[PDB]
Scaffold this active site. Sequence first.
Site: not given
Ligand SMILES: O=C(O)c1ccc(-c2oc3c(Br)cc(Br)cc3c(=O)c2O)cc1
Length: 333
Positions: A44, A155
Amino acid sequence: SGPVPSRARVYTDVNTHRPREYWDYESHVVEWGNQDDYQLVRKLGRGKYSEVFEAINITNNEKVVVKILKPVKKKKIKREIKILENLRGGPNIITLADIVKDPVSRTPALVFEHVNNTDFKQLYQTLTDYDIRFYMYEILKALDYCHSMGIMHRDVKPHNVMIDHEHRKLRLIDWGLAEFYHPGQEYNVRVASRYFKGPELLVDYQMYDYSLDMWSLGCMLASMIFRKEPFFHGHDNYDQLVRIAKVLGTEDLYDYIDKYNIELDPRFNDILGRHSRKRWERFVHSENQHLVSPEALDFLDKLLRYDHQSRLTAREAMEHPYFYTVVKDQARM
Ligand SMILES: O=C(O)c1ccc(-c2oc3c(Br)cc(Br)cc3c(=O)c2O)cc1
């Protein structure tokens, strides 16, 4: 000399009145799971501290998100895990569902809930005046919670705010830089994205607090209502303060420096010069005036302050007239 100390105007000693287990995260013991319980679908996104994959929980066939961590100190891993578990259940806080380690590569991987995220590069084009107010209130709900839980995010940026506009859902993510607030502690100024670095991070003032997050939010609000992303676009950290100084003026900046007896870097005084505090009308044009109101400008000005103590708290922000329409609509359900 030496810099003048600082304490948070709110939630100052909330961590002191908690069990040591709460904030002493070096002593936290992680219960790991098997990453073979999850199958990765697609990447992602990447990043400095992790690579994020969409995955499937094969034990119940439900979509999750796996954040495979990049090699950092074990201390920082425990910190993010403890904070996530502490904040779990909070308003618009990302939900940590699992903590697994790959059997082969032996790498830490945080497993989060899945949210249908629409990217802000395409989202900030369909947002109305109400939409900005609404989502700002949602971020404030998440910030006020973690601040009340003695935690500063450090952040705050659009990249770290997931939004499901179709379901009006919002989640605050990536707490790898988040830290527990302790009155008197001098923290590392090396946090947050350059464009969202508070003045305290730039002038090397280490005794900051929750108010750091309120600055970053201000940078987000400025970007949204003026349609300029990012608002303070500096080329480095030194220029970052200069870009800030060109808007808020050098007058309040040097008063900020003088009040807290901050020894300023011998480079800044050659590139700062002098600037007047520009009125926010100077950033209003035909293409964004529909997002700018006297309520919008007043609320923004009270966030973007050099003096971190003069910035609004999250709760103070939630009581601003800028959110009066949002609050009334949330009460009627
Ligand atoms: O703690 C973190 O660094 C942290 C990163 C990404 C997400 C996170 O990213 C997404 C992204 Br990028 C694209 C899409 Br489509 C969905 C998600 C999603 O459901 C989701 O929890 C959650 C937490």
